[PDB]
From a paper:
H5 and H12 in the 6-helix bundle are discontinuous. dimer indicates clusters of charged residues on both sides of the membrane. transported by [name], K+ is not. structure thus serves as an excellent model for the membrane part of NHE1.
The structure of [name] crystals grown at pH 4 was determined at 3.5 Å by molecular replacement. conspicuous differences to the pH 8 structure are observed near the dimer interface. Six ion bridges that lock the two protomers together at pH 8 break at pH 4. As a result, the two protomers tilt away from each other at lower pH. the cytoplasmic end of H1 and H7/8 present at pH 8 break at pH 4. the 6-helix bundle, but significant rearrangements at the dimer interface. site in protomer B changes only slightly from pH 8 to pH 4.
Author numbering:
A (entry chain B), C (entry chain B): 1 to 420
B (entry chain A), D (entry chain A): 2 to 420
The structure:
């Protein structure tokens, strides 16, 4: 079939998305696994959408959708609230993310023999976190104000970072894919240390440039004074993708850049008392509307990601490695998190921290990166990265997300009473 | 790969923003600014690979159009249609087709091209979109009913302006797509077959259209979905469903989507059935949904215009503007009136001359500008030399530009000097 | 596989061609059906070459190969020898070709219900003749000098003409494919008469223009005086394809044009006694070499055509309609020819003509046009021309060529003694 | 579709003919005339769509090359090779590679491009083909052995000039094709891995080459085929077989074919086995076959050159000729000698300087000119920006032109002033 098949796919996607959201609206079950299972049914079960096409879309979505999503997530948070607990988090992401990634790598490595790189990329994928399916649930069981903040921040920050780790890990697996400066710093200064140097490098660059472009955007809106639709929205998207582009060109993760810009505009209010208020309020409201708009967009993107992930998976590989994946998953949930969150114990009680450690689930970003290695393997051949291992990784990640979301979402309340 | 895409989207959207700025503060209509800026971005700076832009255009040509026409379908009043339904119907069937033919004759006798090619050009330049005229309407206080009938004309010509292109296109491909139209053409000749095919198309499209609209509303009732993002996802879903099925039955999915848009945009009808209580809520929810979609459609519009700007090549358009302008003036001065003269029986002569004269060509042709060239270049069909493609496309560009601008300058003079 | 699969295909083609030619060199059996069967084996039997790829090549070959072949065939004959029997032949081709085409159309029509057009195109395909596999055989059994000439001429002339009929017939089946002037003359003056008017038209145009370009070529070689390789060869090809191009642009069969040019250069010797002989002999020999070269080329092309035809066929359709095809074939052989060659009886005896009528076989051109309708059906969809009918036509043609060549080649000698 | 193709072939071949004419009567070498005429035909007249020409080039790049290199393999003397085999081997391995590297350094420091891109450029401009020099050789009476070693250098550099390109190309594609070279690069680094890969390639290619050659001759004996067209079909068949299998085992099929060409061209060897009676006949049959194939190869050569002429775009080449010429002079004056200095140990200094200086770049680079651009444009690989492609290609054009012409003008002066 021709591009009308793509449209058909689109309709099926959105429709099923709506349906699933209805299920969640009508049943306390999180919408994520519903999305996934729905994708599975709509895909492999009924062969309505083929995996090849599914992936063909999935790359596009993997880019744009994630950009929008991350940007918006950038918009959502509040800098004061994060500054409140700033020292805690930076370590938390940096150490946790990497440590979780590394240890799970070791974890993955044992279950199926693989060069570390494979494991490390697995963890790098599972790196990110998404308690977006818990945030409502927290309010639903009188969860304290304080921790929700730091967790939210953790997710919003680690989402792009998991990618970086992933892109780093992948770059290690395939020579040409690695950017220039990484290659240089690697050959020159080893891979272990090179990873770190490039880490601090691209992080610093990305965040700084993100700030730059962000405030530049703010000033632009200031002078231009665009309070009316749709130019503000268009400008927003253009800005995000700009940050992403430039960021990626300079061998950095443009995702983090855009995200950062989102944080800026989302939490930047600098003005001279000489300035009128006729414009500040207009820009405020404008920003608000644009934000909500992109919230909708990001929602769409999210739905796409989960469902497509659903129709992406190969049942055979899954079932074949069903159990193993499970062990890996629960293992990750109950070992990777607590062990990588140990060095925060000096800030909260042996009981207190246990919650936030044991609670962290895995969602969007890893769901979107599950097919990436497979994508490459299909696109480019490499002995280090077999297609086989691609399918394996993807399957395991699927299981991981499922298990994580389900178990965490289910066992939240029990924790509360049993800890507070 | 995707990096270049990101760059492109960035500069396009940014471009659009800037263009809306300069249009805002200079008061000039935004469209020509769009086209010219796109011109800058593609060929002038050589920043954008024309062919990639062509790919993106291949993307937008269906989806952007679907969305745009859907939202257009929303912004409609069934009542105001009901008032002048015969005027409209006469204007969008007979008038449109006649316009196509006439334009065809023009193109033929100006380029020595085959009449089929000319007719293709006509079909492409059929649809109109005077969204830029509206502010001038409410500003110079043009009579309401006129504005209404013109608008309602556009909303209907946009999708009908598409099928006719697909017709001529299908006529160029020797196999005729092996579709219904092929058969009809074989059993009754191309003319008759074409007519019957048209009627089939429109009929089924509208029936299935209102069908899906109703099914949609009903679905909302049973499901009771009133919140973002569920409602929007639903809307898009329905749109593309309509389109997909539409084309699946060889009918203009665009027409279908538009019709569904009409349904939703004009559905306070089954309100007295259920308690109005929740119904008001769904009404306003639909309203905000519509607004959102309006924004989307605006975006897609920007895409289309700017991309059209970038895709053209100055060599051809220059070498052929000397004739091109003449073609444009030609259609503006001859095609519309001769096609709208049957409408003289209902309305006044002055009113007639006005509504005929004021006929700007907008988005839809721009979206179909590259289409013949694309099909020619891709399918490598013998009847469609690529040069012909460039010719048509350029001609379309000229036409659009000139039409939009002089129509935009017509009003103040055109009103007072006759009405 | 990538374009190396095409190369593989090439090797297989030529190799098997060589093999088959060895068989014919080592066994009196004509090389044509050997080629075909070889193609069948190498194709459908072993799936070494897929039908899709096979056809993809087959279009290319269908063009260029035929051009070269027809051109060379143009070169081969001698104008004096044809002028000897000129009145006989013109009628013979014109009437026979059309009549054979028409009657076989009726013949095809009865065996399987079809609109005439289908039958007419069948006959149009079977139109051409190729006794190239008999020409040696004639010498092998002391066949008289006279008839071989007229038959040779008949083939060389009817080969392009069968195409025209075919292209005409096809054009009738698919609207857009028909050229401009045919369309006009058809709508204006009916299809029956339109066919004739366009026939005389494009024939006259093609032959005239062919002469023009031909002598133009001769003069060019004269002034330029290119006696050395390879410029003469390149120029030859360029000329042929030129004639073909221009011919096709003016809604005429460029094949016939090129062929005609070939006839010209092959048999044109005009010079002033004032002119030296140092150049005439050089151009003579040059022409000779170029001719032989293109003979080789044409041979290659021929091999391609037959073998690819072999790997093109669908065994299922064949077997399904095996018998029917046979009846059609022998029917054609024993009815179409004699009945369409009746009006030459006023020139030769009731016995004499019977030979040349009953002997005409069908070869190259029809072998190359067997897949054309199918080609279109696959490329373009049309209710009048189903893919089904495409496969059918192709199969029937295959059977026809096989049967024709085999039976004629086998039963030649018996005729001689039993008639002379 | 095919109509345009026919037009193209017509004008190309005709063009070639004319070019050979003007080259014949003006005495000037035919190659630059080829390139310039192609220039006329493609961009100048806009007669030929550059991209279609690119397609055709994609066709010729394998087949034309296979034939050309095969026939080249024929025209060879095993004896004369045996004489200076070490000189040759040293010249085609170490010398060639060194030339590539040096050119790479140049390209890098002149365009700021990555060293890999430069090296790609080097690999492309590696191979040489001085077929235009031969007449000047026999005319100005250059020493025989020199001519021989240079020729035998070319015949071997042509295919080796290809693999190195495929190397750098493979290096650009991140997956490295997942081939042997990938593995070797992973286990031993790109340098070592590349070397070992090279040795593997050459070894297997030659072994299998002579294998197929022998198998070919033997086949002829058993089959006793001495006549057109059987013999020719056979030849081509064998060539493409060699190529196919060659590439199937990730080896340069070009190298294989060339080697088989060497085998056939130099096989009077097993004559004393069988009665020479029929053997003389097969010998001469092989001779005429070779001649035929020579004609073919000439044709393909014309194709390649003219097409190269048509494919380029004057904008880029102009905007970058200022540097381009410098790059060319650069390689001619620096790359060869520094790469041929190890050959100083065998031959005299004057002879060395001569054979080094006189190093024209011919067909093979021209065939690989568009290849990086093609792969970049098609695969859309991130490391290969299309602009880079245009740059490389143009640079190659400049290089070829200048090299050929100044080398062609070198000889008369270059001989007497030092030898
Ligand atoms: C700018 C002019 C003032 C207008 C403010 C715009 C609305 C911002 S307030 C904005 O409202 C949402 C939908 O009503 C609420 O979202 C809530 O989430 C709940 C979680 O199950 C759902 O029941 C929703 O129905 C809603 O009650 C609230 O969490 C959010 O903060
Ligand atoms: C121009 C200088 C003189 C050289 C003349 C070139 C050769 C032209 S003569 C040219 O020779 C062919 C191959 O030997 C012959 O072809 C013959 O056909 C026979 C049919 O089974 C085969 O046995 C062949 O071996 C050969 O004897 C002959 O029919 C043809 O006419």
């Amino acid at each position: 079939m021709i591009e009308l098949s793509l449209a058909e796919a689109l309709f099926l996607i959105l429709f099923t998305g709506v349906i699933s959201m209805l299920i969640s609206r009508r049943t306390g079950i999180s919408y994520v696994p519903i999305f996934i299972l729905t994708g599975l049914v709509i895909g492999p079960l009924l062969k309505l959408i083929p995996r090849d096409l599914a992936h063909e879309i999935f790359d596009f979505v993997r880019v744009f959708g994630l950009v929008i999503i991350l940007f918006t997530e950038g918009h959502n948070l509040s800098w004061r609230l994060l500054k409140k607990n700033m020292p805690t988090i930076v370590t938390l992401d940096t150490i946790g993310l990497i440590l979780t990634a590394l240890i799970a790598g070791f974890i993955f490595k044992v279950v199926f023999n693989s060069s570390f790189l494979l494991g490390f990329l697995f963890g790098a994928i599972i790196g990110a976190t998404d308690p977006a399916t818990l945030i409502p649930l927290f309010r639903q069981y009188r969860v304290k104000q304080d921790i929700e903040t730091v967790i939210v921040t953790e997710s919003i920050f680690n989402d792009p970072l998991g990618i970086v780790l992933t892109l780093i890990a992948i770059s290690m697996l395939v020579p040409g894919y690695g950017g220039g400066i990484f290659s240089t710093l690697s050959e020159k200064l080893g891979i272990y240390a090179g990873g770190v140097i490039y880490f601090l490098y691209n992080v610093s660059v990305s965040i700084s440039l993100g700030i730059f472009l962000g405030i530049l955007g703010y000033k632009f809106i200031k002078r231009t004074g665009i309070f009316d639709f749709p130019e503000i929205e268009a400008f927003s998207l253009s800005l995000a993708f700009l940050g992403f582009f430039i960021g990626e060109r300079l061998d950095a993760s443009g995702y983090l850049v855009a995200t950062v810009t989102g944080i800026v505009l989302g939490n930047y209010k600098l003005l001279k008392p000489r300035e009128n208020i006729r414009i500040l309020k207009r820009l405020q409201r404008a920003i608000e509307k644009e934000v909500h708009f992109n919230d909708t967009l990001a929602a769409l993107a999210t739905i796409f990601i989960f469902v497509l992930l659903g129709a992406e998976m190969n049942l055979e590989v899954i079932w074949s490695n069903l159990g193993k994946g499970l062990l890996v998953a629960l293992g990750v949930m109950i070992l990777a998190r607590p062990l990588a969150t140990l060095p925060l114990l000096k800030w909260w009680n042996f009981r207190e921290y246990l919650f936030i450690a044991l609670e962290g689930p895995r969602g969007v970003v890893p769901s979107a990166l599950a097919s990436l290695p497979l994508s490459l393997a299909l696109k480019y051949k490499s002995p280090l990265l077999t297609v086989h291992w691609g399918e394996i990784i993807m399957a395991t990640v699927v299981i991981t997300v499922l298990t994580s979301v389900i178990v965490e979402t289910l066992w939240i309340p029990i924790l509360k009473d049993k800890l507070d």
